Amino acid sequence: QVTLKESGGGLVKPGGSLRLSCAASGFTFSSYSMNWVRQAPGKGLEWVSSISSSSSYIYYADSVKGRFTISRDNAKNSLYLQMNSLRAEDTAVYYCARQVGATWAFDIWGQGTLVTVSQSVLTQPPSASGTPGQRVTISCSGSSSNIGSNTVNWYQQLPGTAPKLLIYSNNQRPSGVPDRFSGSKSGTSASLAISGLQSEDEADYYCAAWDDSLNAWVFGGGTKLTVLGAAAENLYF
């Protein structure tokens, strides 16, 4: 029973401050690097910050650097995100995520907390569609400093759920993912293939890679996959 639970979200005026909290249980919190990832309503995933197991190594997304502060309390098994100089653009659902050291994959995600304050580096097709049984391949195009230098991870986000790790280290499936899902990487581009498409595969798919030039995680804009049947077309010859 591995759980992450975020708290602290709500309505805040621009220029304001909030502190988000992420409570962890069921694992050795003090031995993992942790991250904040956000999702603006109806938009893609956007990494915010990371902190190593003893707080020695901290990174920020360029847009939040100098305004946000990440911290952790290993005694209270808690992760925090202090947000200052809040902007309309900070309106999002904020997720807490655990990072696996050997791969950098985000294998456990929280449930998310909404913050309302009142373009992606990796390139994905915004939509994909297929009929059940077919094979669909989704591309993710990056550059030399990200996909060209580092492994690619893929996350599946089912409607009304938090994202889940789908593929790590380019082509590895975690425990829980069937062989119908396969990943590949060549040069500065990566692909996710879904064989034997099923109605339950209707979800958003995201590719992610560390970028050595930005010193940041870069996520794709997301591919909404639709599984559509029959189609009563009027063919006229």
Using only C-alpha atoms, the chain has a radius of gyration, in whole angstroms, of 18
Supply 196's token pair: 């034997």
Distance in angstroms (rounded) separating the CA atoms of residues 96 and 105: 13
User: Which residues touch 144 (CB under 8 Å, ≥6 apart)?
Assistant: 188
Between the CA atoms of 139, 144, 147 and 148, what dihedral angle is there, to the nearest 10 degrees? 110
**Cα–chain center distance at 35:** 10
Distance in angstroms (rounded) separating the CA atoms of residues 48 and 213: 16
Contact (Cβ atoms closer than 8 angstroms) between residue 145 and residue 40? no
Residue 44 DSSP one-character state: -
Distance in angstroms (rounded) separating the CA atoms of residues 20 and 32: 19
- Spell 80-90 as b/e; 16+ CB within 10 A means b: bbebeebeeeb
* Amino acid, single-letter form, for residue 169: S
Please state, in angstroms and as integers, the Cα–Cα distance from residue 179 to each residue in 16, 151, 200, following that order. 47, 19, 15
How is the chain split into domains, by residue range?
1-119, 120-221
Residue 43 DSSP one-character state: S
User: Which residues touch 231 (CB under 8 Å, ≥6 apart)?
Assistant: none
Method used to determine the 3D structure: X-ray
**Cα–chain center distance at 92:** 13
Token pair 């621009």 is found at 14
Distance in angstroms (rounded) separating the CA atoms of residues 167 and 153: 5
> Comparing C-alpha atoms, which of 40, 47, 70, 72 is closest to residue 216?
47
Distance in angstroms (rounded) separating the CA atoms of residues 137 and 110: 28
Q: Which residues of the chain come before a gap where C and the next N are over 2.5 Å apart?
A: 118
Contact (Cβ atoms closer than 8 angstroms) between residue 155 and residue 208? yes
* Amino acid, single-letter form, for residue 107: D
